[PDB]
PDB file of all heavy atoms in Angstrom:
ATOM      1  N   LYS U  15     123.161 150.648 114.613  1.00 51.12           N
ATOM      2  CA  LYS U  15     122.949 149.124 114.848  1.00 51.12           C
ATOM      3  C   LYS U  15     124.323 148.529 115.061  1.00 51.12           C
ATOM      4  O   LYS U  15     125.154 148.481 114.091  1.00 51.12           O
ATOM      5  CB  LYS U  15     122.212 148.559 113.705  1.00 51.12           C
ATOM      6  CG  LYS U  15     121.791 147.124 113.934  1.00 51.12           C
ATOM      7  CD  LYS U  15     120.699 146.568 112.976  1.00 51.12           C
ATOM      8  CE  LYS U  15     120.644 145.032 113.006  1.00 51.12           C
ATOM      9  NZ  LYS U  15     119.455 144.655 112.146  1.00 51.12           N
ATOM     10  N   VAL U  16     124.646 148.062 116.246  1.00 49.66           N
ATOM     11  CA  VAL U  16     125.899 147.364 116.582  1.00 49.66           C
ATOM     12  C   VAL U  16     125.825 145.946 116.246  1.00 49.66           C
ATOM     13  O   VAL U  16     126.780 145.339 115.659  1.00 49.66           O
ATOM     14  CB  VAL U  16     126.274 147.556 118.091  1.00 49.66           C
ATOM     15  CG1 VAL U  16     127.543 146.731 118.434  1.00 49.66           C
ATOM     16  CG2 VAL U  16     126.483 149.005 118.401  1.00 49.66           C
ATOM     17  N   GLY U  17     124.612 145.290 116.374  1.00 51.22           N
ATOM     18  CA  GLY U  17     124.391 143.806 116.145  1.00 51.22           C
ATOM     19  C   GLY U  17     123.438 143.312 117.099  1.00 51.22           C
ATOM     20  O   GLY U  17     122.808 144.037 117.911  1.00 51.22           O
ATOM     21  N   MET U  18     123.232 142.008 117.052  1.00 50.04           N
ATOM     22  CA  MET U  18     122.252 141.217 117.942  1.00 50.04           C
ATOM     23  C   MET U  18     122.985 140.367 118.903  1.00 50.04           C
ATOM     24  O   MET U  18     124.119 139.929 118.503  1.00 50.04           O
ATOM     25  CB  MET U  18     121.254 140.523 117.043  1.00 50.04           C
ATOM     26  CG  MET U  18     120.221 141.335 116.395  1.00 50.04           C
ATOM     27  SD  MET U  18     118.805 140.434 115.775  1.00 50.04           S
ATOM     28  CE  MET U  18     117.940 140.127 117.341  1.00 50.04           C
ATOM     29  N   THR U  19     122.429 140.130 120.068  1.00 50.21           N
ATOM     30  CA  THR U  19     122.855 139.191 121.041  1.00 50.21           C
ATOM     31  C   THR U  19     121.710 138.674 121.799  1.00 50.21           C
ATOM     32  O   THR U  19     120.512 138.826 121.381  1.00 50.21           O
ATOM     33  CB  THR U  19     124.051 139.728 121.792  1.00 50.21           C
ATOM     34  OG1 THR U  19     124.569 138.664 122.570  1.00 50.21           O
ATOM     35  CG2 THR U  19     123.693 140.972 122.669  1.00 50.21           C
ATOM     36  N   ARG U  20     121.916 138.185 123.002  1.00 51.70           N
ATOM     37  CA  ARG U  20     120.930 137.770 123.941  1.00 51.70           C
ATOM     38  C   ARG U  20     121.207 138.252 125.342  1.00 51.70           C
ATOM     39  O   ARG U  20     122.320 138.404 125.722  1.00 51.70           O
ATOM     40  CB  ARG U  20     120.694 136.273 123.832  1.00 51.70           C
ATOM     41  CG  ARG U  20     121.809 135.502 124.613  1.00 51.70           C
ATOM     42  CD  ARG U  20     122.078 134.209 123.904  1.00 51.70           C
ATOM     43  NE  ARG U  20     121.023 133.160 123.991  1.00 51.70           N
ATOM     44  CZ  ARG U  20     121.069 131.999 123.546  1.00 51.70           C
ATOM     45  NH1 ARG U  20     122.226 131.549 122.931  1.00 51.70           N
ATOM     46  NH2 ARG U  20     120.190 131.137 123.631  1.00 51.70           N
ATOM     47  N   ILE U  21     120.161 138.453 126.114  1.00 52.08           N
ATOM     48  CA  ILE U  21     120.266 138.649 127.586  1.00 52.08           C
ATOM     49  C   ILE U  21     119.568 137.449 128.156  1.00 52.08           C
ATOM     50  O   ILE U  21     118.371 137.174 127.987  1.00 52.08           O
ATOM     51  CB  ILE U  21     119.579 139.935 128.001  1.00 52.08           C
ATOM     52  CG1 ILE U  21     120.279 141.192 127.399  1.00 52.08           C
ATOM     53  CG2 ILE U  21     119.584 140.044 129.577  1.00 52.08           C
ATOM     54  CD1 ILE U  21     121.706 141.342 127.608  1.00 52.08           C
ATOM     55  N   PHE U  22     120.315 136.618 129.052  1.00 53.40           N
ATOM     56  CA  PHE U  22     119.761 135.553 129.785  1.00 53.40           C
ATOM     57  C   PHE U  22     119.186 136.266 131.118  1.00 53.40           C
ATOM     58  O   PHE U  22     119.917 136.922 131.756  1.00 53.40           O
ATOM     59  CB  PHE U  22     120.810 134.538 130.147  1.00 53.40           C
ATOM     60  CG  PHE U  22     121.126 133.623 129.032  1.00 53.40           C
ATOM     61  CD1 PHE U  22     122.326 133.584 128.543  1.00 53.40           C
ATOM     62  CD2 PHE U  22     120.147 132.746 128.531  1.00 53.40           C
ATOM     63  CE1 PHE U  22     122.779 132.674 127.476  1.00 53.40           C
ATOM     64  CE2 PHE U  22     120.504 131.885 127.440  1.00 53.40           C
ATOM     65  CZ  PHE U  22     121.786 131.797 126.960  1.00 53.40           C
ATOM     66  N   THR U  23     117.924 135.990 131.481  1.00 50.46           N
ATOM     67  CA  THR U  23     117.393 136.433 132.704  1.00 50.46           C
ATOM     68  C   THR U  23     117.666 135.310 133.785  1.00 50.46           C
ATOM     69  O   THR U  23     117.874 134.202 133.471  1.00 50.46           O
ATOM     70  CB  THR U  23     115.907 136.641 132.584  1.00 50.46           C
ATOM     71  OG1 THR U  23     115.179 135.374 132.367  1.00 50.46           O
ATOM     72  CG2 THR U  23     115.472 137.613 131.405  1.00 50.46           C
ATOM     73  N   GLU U  24     117.455 135.675 135.069  1.00 49.95           N
ATOM     74  CA  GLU U  24     117.642 134.772 136.169  1.00 49.95           C
ATOM     75  C   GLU U  24     116.631 133.615 136.120  1.00 49.95           C
ATOM     76  O   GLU U  24     117.065 132.514 136.444  1.00 49.95           O
ATOM     77  CB  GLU U  24     117.330 135.557 137.472  1.00 49.95           C
ATOM     78  CG  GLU U  24     118.418 136.711 137.738  1.00 49.95           C
ATOM     79  CD  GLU U  24     118.204 137.482 139.046  1.00 49.95           C
ATOM     80  OE1 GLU U  24     117.100 138.059 139.147  1.00 49.95           O
ATOM     81  OE2 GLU U  24     119.067 137.370 139.923  1.00 49.95           O
ATOM     82  N   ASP U  25     115.346 133.833 135.599  1.00 48.41           N
ATOM     83  CA  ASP U  25     114.384 132.739 135.546  1.00 48.41           C
ATOM     84  C   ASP U  25     114.561 131.933 134.240  1.00 48.41           C
ATOM     85  O   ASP U  25     113.653 131.245 133.907  1.00 48.41           O
ATOM     86  CB  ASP U  25     112.981 133.370 135.641  1.00 48.41           C
ATOM     87  CG  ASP U  25     112.656 134.124 136.927  1.00 48.41           C
ATOM     88  OD1 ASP U  25     113.694 134.206 137.734  1.00 48.41           O
ATOM     89  OD2 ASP U  25     111.509 134.568 137.138  1.00 48.41           O
ATOM     90  N   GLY U  26     115.648 132.065 133.522  1.00 46.84           N
ATOM     91  CA  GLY U  26     115.987 131.099 132.414  1.00 46.84           C
ATOM     92  C   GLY U  26     115.229 131.537 131.064  1.00 46.84           C
ATOM     93  O   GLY U  26     114.885 130.654 130.378  1.00 46.84           O
ATOM     94  N   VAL U  27     114.934 132.796 130.832  1.00 49.95           N
ATOM     95  CA  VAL U  27     114.532 133.310 129.546  1.00 49.95           C
ATOM     96  C   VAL U  27     115.667 133.888 128.875  1.00 49.95           C
ATOM     97  O   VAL U  27     116.479 134.552 129.454  1.00 49.95           O
ATOM     98  CB  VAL U  27     113.316 134.308 129.739  1.00 49.95           C
ATOM     99  CG1 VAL U  27     112.932 134.870 128.314  1.00 49.95           C
ATOM    100  CG2 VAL U  27     112.118 133.673 130.398  1.00 49.95           C
ATOM    101  N   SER U  28     115.830 133.505 127.643  1.00 45.89           N
ATOM    102  CA  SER U  28     116.785 134.193 126.714  1.00 45.89           C
ATOM    103  C   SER U  28     116.079 135.275 125.941  1.00 45.89           C
ATOM    104  O   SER U  28     115.183 134.920 125.165  1.00 45.89           O
ATOM    105  CB  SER U  28     117.446 133.164 125.777  1.00 45.89           C
ATOM    106  OG  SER U  28     118.326 133.788 124.862  1.00 45.89           O
ATOM    107  N   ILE U  29     116.378 136.549 126.130  1.00 44.87           N
ATOM    108  CA  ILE U  29     115.794 137.715 125.412  1.00 44.87           C
ATOM    109  C   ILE U  29     116.649 137.996 124.177  1.00 44.87           C
ATOM    110  O   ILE U  29     117.790 138.330 124.423  1.00 44.87           O
ATOM    111  CB  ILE U  29     115.524 138.850 126.348  1.00 44.87           C
ATOM    112  CG1 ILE U  29     114.779 138.452 127.455  1.00 44.87           C
ATOM    113  CG2 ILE U  29     114.837 139.992 125.534  1.00 44.87           C
ATOM    114  CD1 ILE U  29     114.823 139.581 128.636  1.00 44.87           C
ATOM    115  N   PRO U  30     116.120 137.894 122.887  1.00 50.92           N
ATOM    116  CA  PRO U  30     117.033 138.287 121.811  1.00 50.92           C
ATOM    117  C   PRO U  30     117.036 139.811 121.797  1.00 50.92           C
ATOM    118  O   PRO U  30     115.904 140.432 121.991  1.00 50.92           O
ATOM    119  CB  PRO U  30     116.199 137.716 120.584  1.00 50.92           C
ATOM    120  CG  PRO U  30     114.762 137.729 121.016  1.00 50.92           C
ATOM    121  CD  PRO U  30     114.858 137.368 122.507  1.00 50.92           C
ATOM    122  N   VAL U  31     118.117 140.406 121.720  1.00 52.02           N
ATOM    123  CA  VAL U  31     118.261 141.866 121.728  1.00 52.02           C
ATOM    124  C   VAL U  31     119.078 142.427 120.512  1.00 52.02           C
ATOM    125  O   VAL U  31     119.950 141.801 120.068  1.00 52.02           O
ATOM    126  CB  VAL U  31     118.861 142.359 123.039  1.00 52.02           C
ATOM    127  CG1 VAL U  31     117.967 142.028 124.215  1.00 52.02           C
ATOM    128  CG2 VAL U  31     120.297 141.883 123.205  1.00 52.02           C
ATOM    129  N   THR U  32     118.626 143.617 120.035  1.00 53.77           N
ATOM    130  CA  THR U  32     119.488 144.406 119.195  1.00 53.77           C
ATOM    131  C   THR U  32     120.181 145.381 120.069  1.00 53.77           C
ATOM    132  O   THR U  32     119.520 146.090 120.877  1.00 53.77           O
ATOM    133  CB  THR U  32     118.615 145.115 118.104  1.00 53.77           C
ATOM    134  OG1 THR U  32     117.967 144.167 117.313  1.00 53.77           O
ATOM    135  CG2 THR U  32     119.615 146.025 117.277  1.00 53.77           C
ATOM    136  N   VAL U  33     121.472 145.470 119.896  1.00 52.86           N
ATOM    137  CA  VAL U  33     122.239 146.472 120.570  1.00 52.86           C
ATOM    138  C   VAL U  33     122.351 147.742 119.671  1.00 52.86           C
ATOM    139  O   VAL U  33     122.796 147.585 118.540  1.00 52.86           O
ATOM    140  CB  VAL U  33     123.639 145.854 120.842  1.00 52.86           C
ATOM    141  CG1 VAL U  33     124.599 146.825 121.615  1.00 52.86           C
ATOM    142  CG2 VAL U  33     123.573 144.555 121.589  1.00 52.86           C
ATOM    143  N   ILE U  34     121.876 148.880 120.209  1.00 50.34           N
ATOM    144  CA  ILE U  34     121.984 150.156 119.525  1.00 50.34           C
ATOM    145  C   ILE U  34     122.921 151.075 120.274  1.00 50.34           C
ATOM    146  O   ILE U  34     122.641 151.308 121.439  1.00 50.34           O
ATOM    147  CB  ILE U  34     120.556 150.762 119.468  1.00 50.34           C
ATOM    148  CG1 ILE U  34     119.573 149.757 118.770  1.00 50.34           C
ATOM    149  CG2 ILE U  34     120.572 152.099 118.724  1.00 50.34           C
ATOM    150  CD1 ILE U  34     118.160 150.293 118.785  1.00 50.34           C
ATOM    151  N   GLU U  35     124.010 151.501 119.612  1.00 49.42           N
ATOM    152  CA  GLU U  35     124.919 152.443 120.229  1.00 49.42           C
ATOM    153  C   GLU U  35     124.298 153.862 119.971  1.00 49.42           C
ATOM    154  O   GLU U  35     124.096 154.220 118.866  1.00 49.42           O
ATOM    155  CB  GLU U  35     126.269 152.396 119.510  1.00 49.42           C
ATOM    156  CG  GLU U  35     127.283 153.354 120.058  1.00 49.42           C
ATOM    157  CD  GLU U  35     128.713 153.156 119.496  1.00 49.42           C
ATOM    158  OE1 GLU U  35     128.854 153.140 118.295  1.00 49.42           O
ATOM    159  OE2 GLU U  35     129.661 153.105 120.371  1.00 49.42           O
ATOM    160  N   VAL U  36     124.000 154.521 121.126  1.00 47.11           N
ATOM    161  CA  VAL U  36     123.481 155.885 121.110  1.00 47.11           C
ATOM    162  C   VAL U  36     124.395 156.827 121.785  1.00 47.11           C
ATOM    163  O   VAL U  36     124.388 156.999 123.031  1.00 47.11           O
ATOM    164  CB  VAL U  36     122.035 155.874 121.735  1.00 47.11           C
ATOM    165  CG1 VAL U  36     121.364 157.236 121.695  1.00 47.11           C
ATOM    166  CG2 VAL U  36     121.090 154.859 121.122  1.00 47.11           C
ATOM    167  N   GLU U  37     125.322 157.399 120.991  1.00 48.11           N
ATOM    168  CA  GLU U  37     126.203 158.434 121.492  1.00 48.11           C
ATOM    169  C   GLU U  37     125.358 159.741 121.614  1.00 48.11           C
ATOM    170  O   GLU U  37     124.319 159.858 121.123  1.00 48.11           O
ATOM    171  CB  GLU U  37     127.303 158.658 120.389  1.00 48.11           C
ATOM    172  CG  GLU U  37     128.215 157.438 120.181  1.00 48.11           C
ATOM    173  CD  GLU U  37     129.214 157.746 119.106  1.00 48.11           C
ATOM    174  OE1 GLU U  37     129.511 158.800 118.831  1.00 48.11           O
ATOM    175  OE2 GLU U  37     129.742 156.629 118.688  1.00 48.11           O
ATOM    176  N   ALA U  38     125.960 160.684 122.359  1.00 50.44           N
ATOM    177  CA  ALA U  38     125.324 161.993 122.570  1.00 50.44           C
ATOM    178  C   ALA U  38     124.826 162.606 121.238  1.00 50.44           C
ATOM    179  O   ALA U  38     125.544 162.652 120.268  1.00 50.44           O
ATOM    180  CB  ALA U  38     126.288 162.971 123.112  1.00 50.44           C
ATOM    181  N   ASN U  39     123.544 162.924 121.157  1.00 46.08           N
ATOM    182  CA  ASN U  39     123.035 163.650 120.088  1.00 46.08           C
ATOM    183  C   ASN U  39     123.092 165.083 120.443  1.00 46.08           C
ATOM    184  O   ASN U  39     122.542 165.541 121.460  1.00 46.08           O
ATOM    185  CB  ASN U  39     121.505 163.286 119.874  1.00 46.08           C
ATOM    186  CG  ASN U  39     121.273 161.987 119.169  1.00 46.08           C
ATOM    187  OD1 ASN U  39     120.359 161.824 118.452  1.00 46.08           O
ATOM    188  ND2 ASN U  39     122.074 160.997 119.470  1.00 46.08           N
ATOM    189  N   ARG U  40     123.783 165.896 119.559  1.00 49.53           N
ATOM    190  CA  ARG U  40     123.976 167.370 119.812  1.00 49.53           C
ATOM    191  C   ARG U  40     123.021 168.201 119.001  1.00 49.53           C
ATOM    192  O   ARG U  40     122.997 167.988 117.784  1.00 49.53           O
ATOM    193  CB  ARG U  40     125.427 167.675 119.397  1.00 49.53           C
ATOM    194  CG  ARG U  40     126.528 166.800 120.149  1.00 49.53           C
ATOM    195  CD  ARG U  40     127.918 167.149 119.802  1.00 49.53           C
ATOM    196  NE  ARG U  40     128.148 166.791 118.313  1.00 49.53           N
ATOM    197  CZ  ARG U  40     128.632 165.619 117.773  1.00 49.53           C
ATOM    198  NH1 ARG U  40     128.538 164.564 118.580  1.00 49.53           N
ATOM    199  NH2 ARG U  40     129.104 165.586 116.662  1.00 49.53           N
ATOM    200  N   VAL U  41     122.305 169.151 119.644  1.00 49.42           N
ATOM    201  CA  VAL U  41     121.300 169.911 118.947  1.00 49.42           C
ATOM    202  C   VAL U  41     121.993 171.005 118.085  1.00 49.42           C
ATOM    203  O   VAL U  41     122.709 171.770 118.600  1.00 49.42           O
ATOM    204  CB  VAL U  41     120.272 170.586 120.038  1.00 49.42           C
ATOM    205  CG1 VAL U  41     119.345 171.427 119.268  1.00 49.42           C
ATOM    206  CG2 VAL U  41     119.628 169.581 120.816  1.00 49.42           C
TER     207      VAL U  41
END
């Protein structure tokens, strides 16, 4: 969990987002 922010869409919606850092998972 990196933190939360928002994505503004072109049609003027603010989407609340959690930013998840997903580095390579090695088997």
Side-chain angles (χ1 to χ4, degrees):
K15 186 166 169 173
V16 176
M18 283 193 79
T19 187
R20 73 213 294 182
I21 300 301
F22 285 117
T23 68
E24 294 180 298
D25 301 3
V27 177
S28 178
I29 304 167
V31 295
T32 302
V33 181
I34 306 175
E35 178 173 54
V36 181
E37 300 178 16
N39 284 213
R40 303 177 300 269
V41 179

